[PDB]
Amino acid sequence: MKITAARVIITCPGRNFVTLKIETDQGVYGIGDATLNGRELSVVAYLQEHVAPCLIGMDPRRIEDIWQYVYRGAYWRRGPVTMRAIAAVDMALWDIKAKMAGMPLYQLLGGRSRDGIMVYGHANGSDIAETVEAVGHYIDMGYKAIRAQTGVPGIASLPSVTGWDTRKALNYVPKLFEELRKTYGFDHHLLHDGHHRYTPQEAANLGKMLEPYQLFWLEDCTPAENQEAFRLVRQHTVTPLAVGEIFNTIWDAKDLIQNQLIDYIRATVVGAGGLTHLRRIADLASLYQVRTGCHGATDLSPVTMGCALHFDTWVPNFGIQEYMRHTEETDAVFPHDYWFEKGELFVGETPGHGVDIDEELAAKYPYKPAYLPVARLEDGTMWNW
Amino acid sequence: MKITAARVIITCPGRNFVTLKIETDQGVYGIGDATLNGRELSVVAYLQEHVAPCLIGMDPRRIEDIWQYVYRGAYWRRGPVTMRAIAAVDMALWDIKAKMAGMPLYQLLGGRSRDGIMVYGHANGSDIAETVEAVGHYIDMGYKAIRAQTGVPGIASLPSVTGWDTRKALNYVPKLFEELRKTYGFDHHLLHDGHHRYTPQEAANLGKMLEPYQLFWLEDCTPAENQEAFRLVRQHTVTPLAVGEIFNTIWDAKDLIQNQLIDYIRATVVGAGGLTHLRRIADLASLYQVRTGCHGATDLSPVTMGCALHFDTWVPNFGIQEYMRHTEETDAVFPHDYWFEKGELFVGETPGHGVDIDEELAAKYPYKPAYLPVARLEDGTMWNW
Ligand SMILES: O=C(O)C(=O)C[C@H](O)[C@H](O)CO
Ligand SMILES: O=C(O)C(=O)C[C@H](O)[C@H](O)CO
Ligand SMILES: [Mg+2]
Ligand SMILES: [Mg+2]
Numbered sequence: 001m002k003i004t005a006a007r008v009i010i011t012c013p014g015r016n017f018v019t020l021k022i023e024t025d026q027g028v029y030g031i032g033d034a035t036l037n038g039r040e041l042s043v044v045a046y047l048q049e050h051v052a053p054c055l056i057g058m059d060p061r062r063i064e065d066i067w068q069y070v071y072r073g074a075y076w077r078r079g080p081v082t083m084r085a086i087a088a089v090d091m092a093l094w095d096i097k098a099k100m101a102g103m104p105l106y107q108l109l110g111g112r113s114r115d116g117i118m119v120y121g122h123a124n125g126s127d128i129a130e131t132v133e134a135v136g137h138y139i140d141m142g143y144k145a146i147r148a149q150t151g152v153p154g155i156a157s158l159p160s161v162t163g164w165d166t167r168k169a170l171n172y173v174p175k176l177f178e179e180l181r182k183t184y185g186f187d188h189h190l191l192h193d194g195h196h197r198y199t200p201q202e203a204a205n206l207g208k209m210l211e212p213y214q215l216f217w218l219e220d221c222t223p224a225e226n227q228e229a230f231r232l233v234r235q236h237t238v239t240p241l242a243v244g245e246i247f248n249t250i251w252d253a254k255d256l257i258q259n260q261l262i263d264y265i266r267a268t269v270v271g272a273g274g275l276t277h278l279r280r281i282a283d284l285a286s287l288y289q290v291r292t293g294c295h296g297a298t299d300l301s302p303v304t305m306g307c308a309l310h311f312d313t314w315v316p317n318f319g320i321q322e323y324m325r326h327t328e329e330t331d332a333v334f335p336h337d338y339w340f341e342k343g344e345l346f347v348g349e350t351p352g353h354g355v356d357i358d359e360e361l362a363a364k365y366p367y368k369p370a371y372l373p374v375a376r377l378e379d380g381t382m383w384n385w
Numbered sequence: 386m387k388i389t390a391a392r393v394i395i396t397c398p399g400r401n402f403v404t405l406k407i408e409t410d411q412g413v414y415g416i417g418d419a420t421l422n423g424r425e426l427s428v429v430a431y432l433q434e435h436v437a438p439c440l441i442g443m444d445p446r447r448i449e450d451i452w453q454y455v456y457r458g459a460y461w462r463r464g465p466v467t468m469r470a471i472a473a474v475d476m477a478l479w480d481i482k483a484k485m486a487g488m489p490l491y492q493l494l495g496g497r498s499r500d501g502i503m504v505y506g507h508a509n510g511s512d513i514a515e516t517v518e519a520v521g522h523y524i525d526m527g528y529k530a531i532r533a534q535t536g537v538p539g540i541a542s543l544p545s546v547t548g549w550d551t552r553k554a555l556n557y558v559p560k561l562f563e564e565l566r567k568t569y570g571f572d573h574h575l576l577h578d579g580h581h582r583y584t585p586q587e588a589a590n591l592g593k594m595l596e597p598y599q600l601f602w603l604e605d606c607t608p609a610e611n612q613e614a615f616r617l618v619r620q621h622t623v624t625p626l627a628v629g630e631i632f633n634t635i636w637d638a639k640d641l642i643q644n645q646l647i648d649y650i651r652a653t654v655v656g657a658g659g660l661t662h663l664r665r666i667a668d669l670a671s672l673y674q675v676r677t678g679c680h681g682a683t684d685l686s687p688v689t690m691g692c693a694l695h696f697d698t699w700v701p702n703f704g705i706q707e708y709m710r711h712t713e714e715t716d717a718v719f720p721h722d723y724w725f726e727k728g729e730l731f732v733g734e735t736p737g738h739g740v741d742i743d744e745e746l747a748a749k750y751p752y753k754p755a756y757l758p759v760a761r762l763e764d765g766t767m768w769n770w
Contacts, residue, residue, distance in 0.1 A: 036461060037460070037461075038435065038459065038460060038461075039431060039435050039459060039461065039467075041430045041431075041434040041435065042427050042428075042430045042431035042434070042435065042466055043427070044430065045426045045427045045429065045430035045431075046424060046426075046427035046430075046466065049426040049427070049754070050423065050424050050426065050427065050754075050756075053543065053754070054543060054544060054756070065767055068767035069759065069767050072759070072767055072768065072769050072770070073544060073757075073759040073767075073770070074423070074424065074465075075422070075423060075631065075757045075770065076421060076422075076423075076424065076465030076631050076633070076656075077465070077610060077631060078463070078464060078465075078610065079463060079464025079465050079466055079467060079633070080459075080461035080462070080463075080464050080466075080467060081427055081431065081464055081465075081466035081467065082424075082464060082465060082466065158438065158439060159439060159458060225462060225463065225634070225636040226636065226639065246460065246461050246462060248461075248464070249610070251610040251611065254611065271461075369434070369438070371435075371439070372458075372460045374454065374457070374458040382450055382453035382454050382457055382458075383457070384457055385457070385458070385460065
């Protein structure tokens with residue numbers, strides 16, 4: 001058995017998505033997500049111009065070997081572009097193996113550990129009043145967990161520039177959660193995304209102020225290239241901590257996990273090298289009772305969601321799954337076997353990861369440049385968005 | 386003052402090279418290296434399709450702000466592709482600032498700390514006899530330091546597959562250095578590149594066996610994604626340790642440095658985000674008396690070498706500079722103001738980093754795909770090349 005082609009497909013059914021399709025001389029084929037929001041074409045080149053030519057002729061059944069080949073063979077290891085390419089290959093290969101086995105992917109990973117996959121939605125508002133309303137809406141839709149984000153009073157052809165001020169946020173954010181618990185009580189899981197805006201001391205300060213509100217987690221409270229950054233936070237607060245959507249290898253989280261500085265690892269199948277590698281991250285996390293909390297914004301295509309759900313269905317130390325709804329056009333371009341119902345996602349029995357791509361339809365939505373925004377402090381200082 | 390264009394130029398005068406040219410409305414321009422061996426086009430896309438459009442209209446004098454903008458603004462941080470792009474921008478901007486100041490780059494960094502730049506050459510042989518002869522050649526040429534690599538008995542358009550066996554190497558490499566010292570004595574600096582082939586224990590074993598031969602350094606002895614990997618080596622041998630050519634940010638070396646696990650940091654201007662970032666790496670290293678030993682293979686264009694030499698001329702804790710001669714064609718495409726003389730490199734007084742690119746000549750050498758080799762053990766296990 002041999003790989004006869006590894007093609008990259010680009011489409012924009014509401015937003016940009018890059019997909020890798022691996023074809024074999026035995027009819028069966030697999031697809032993987034390679035989307036890197038804001039830098040999509042760099043991954044297209046990485047795959048199309050370098051990796052794909054190497055895959056031709058290889059035995060697609062050798063998932064581990066190919067993973068090691070692309071990971072070690074690159075010589076320059078790790079990285080967002082590098083790991084997105086590896087992830088696309090890995091997803092496509094697991095898709096092929098599950099199809100060949102005649103089973104939905106989760107069966108190959110070890111079988112079902114749960115029925116439904118708990119998710120959380122995004123309740124946003126320009127102020128506390130509006131955000132409180134948004135959370136109520138998600139509660140009415142049957143969500144068990146809701147992430148609440150509010151604008152702070154006083155604070156995509158090219159990157160939009162957003163402003164930020166820590167003191168203003170510190171004086172406002174706690175009030176949001178105080179009102180939420182006062183309004184809806186403590187039955188629902190409430191989440192907050194710090195989005196890399198605080199220093200460790202400020203994150204500890206915020207976490208402490210949020211303690212009486214029992215949050216499910218405070219996410220990405222401070223930049224984590226330095227894994228010691230969560231030390232001060234963990235030492236001063238019991239508010240659960242989550243991090244990792246931008247991580248791409250287990251090396252980005254090894255210390256955060258072993259030093260027990262986090263409660264949830266947010267790494268994803270597309271961000272951290274496919275099922276092959278994400279499984280290793282989850283296993284390490286399980287040793288310290290850290291649970292998975294896979295990132296799941298819309299810039300992760302339905303192919304990733306399919307793989308993520310198969311993973312979530314099997315993984316023992318499952319925590320929660322982020323869920324942002326894709327547009328109808330995206331759902332049409334990426335036929336998938338998973339659905340949402342009363343606060344939970346469910347993956348189907350379709351062999352493979354259950355997702356596919358309609359190449360003919362995909363071609364009707366041409367690529368369109370789009371950037372993530374950037375953030376600057378009031379004095380103009382480049383900050384973390 | 387504004388950036389009017391940020392163009393990517395590709396040329397293959399003996400091997401592939403990618404250059405970024407930043408033009409301004411004032412007229413002055415700067416160039417930077419963006420070459421990523423074996424994955425060159427991914428950086429081309431990263432710069433051409435994403436970063437470049439953002440630079441237009443920016444004030445090229447704001448080197449630090451632009452570095453932070455591209456680094457933080459990408460959202461997905463670090464990585465070989467990411468940092469190569471950032472380095473190309475940084476090199477071009479420093480080139481511009483030095484031209485505007487009317488001074489060679491080293492003057493802007495803090496002035497001259499030394500006259501010549503000590504380098505090491507590459508003595509290679511199929512066996513010990515041949516390698517010993519090769520080292521004698523570099524000694525003849527006036528090299529104060531020589532890297533010695535030998536083939537081990539019993540051990541392009543697509544990646545070549547090389548073989549490897551640790552036990553065979555462990556039984557042979559020590560003999561190479563024993564013969565070198567017996568033949569040439571201890572006056573010259575002798576280096577060895579383990580090239581990621583050993584586990585920490587084996588590296589510690591090799592390190593101890595090489596101790597009687599007083600090496601300048603044992604390089605990349607074991608894969609370092611896990612910075613704790615050098616612990617065992619450092620605990621068991623006094624042989625100097627070097628690592629870092631594949632690193633792209635200070636985060637890849639922070640622990641190796643602070644835990645005093647290495648003696649030389651090999652990060653480069655092109656690999657680790659330009660002068661702006663490499664400077665921070667060098668400063669951290671100096672606190673622990675770790676010295677710079679910049680990587681300098683041919684896949685680093687003359688633009689990188691120029692910037693590297695300006696850096697080497699100033700940096701207080703300079704250790705050594707690797708030097709692999711480029712082809713005559715490459716030197717013609719990249720006119721530079723630096724030269725070699727009796728084991729030392731010297732940077733010139735030309736304002737900027739002293740290097741430029743002849744676009745008309747560059748266009749005569751079209752890109753040609755070339756991959757780095759991969760390594761497999763005797764049983765077929767994918768290994769580190
Ligand atoms: O939903 C979240 O948790 C996010 O932070 C969304 C991210 O900004 C987005 O996926 C970046 O592409
Ligand atoms: O010369 C050295 O130290 C090297 O290891 C060379 C590398 O293999 C080469 O630059 C990779 O592109
Ligand atoms: Mg987030
Ligand atoms: Mg080396």
